Amino acid sequence: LAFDWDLGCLAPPPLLPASQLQLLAGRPLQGALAISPAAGSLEPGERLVCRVSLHAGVTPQVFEGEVRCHVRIDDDAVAEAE
Amino acid sequence: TLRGRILDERQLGALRYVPPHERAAARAAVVAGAAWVPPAMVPF
Amino acid sequence: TAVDEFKAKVRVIARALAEEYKAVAEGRHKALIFELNRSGKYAQ
Q1: Minimal CA–CA distance to A64: which of A54, A73, A72, A74?
Q2: Which of A21, A58, A62 has the highest number of chain B CBs within 10 A, making it the mutation to test binding with B?
Q3: At A7, which helix (H) or strand (E)?
Q4: Nearest residue of C to residue A60 by CA position?
Q5: Can you tell which superkingdom this protein's organism belongs to (chain A) (predicted)?
Q6: In the list A55, B2, B40, C42, which could disulfide-bond A32, CB 3.0-4.6 Å?
Q7: Taking a C-beta distance cutoff of 8 angstroms, is the pair A30, B6 a contact?
């Protein structure tokens, strides 16, 4: 399974430098969410640890967001096996 | 789904907005540093 | 010694503040305060 990570409204602005936190302006989270594996392949019956880290900004906030993880069959891997 | 409370230092010290479910953790984080604050390097 | 250390650090911070003051009247001062809070340099 190919595992990709997406943030609906939680995306970081294109962790964050402390001096340049103004990039968080206009962003719903007012933080930077990141996950250690952005997109990794995974063998069957293999458990993967994913570290979700939040670096918050200067504005107090209460967030109840949703983070999506997309899982697809690894065509490259199965083709390699064949 | 991830839910969290980014709270100011004053609000944390007074426990102004921490939910009762997590007030113990909030008091812990206030009295004894339990959350990291990456300092990086100062501009000046 | 501590007073001299404070004076030196304050002089450096004030030179940085003067650079930011050059960047961007009373409206200017309010905007600079707001921008410092937004950027988080005020936290440091």
Answers
A1: A54
A2: A62
A3: strand A2-7
A4: C38
A5: Eukaryota
A6: A55
A7: yes
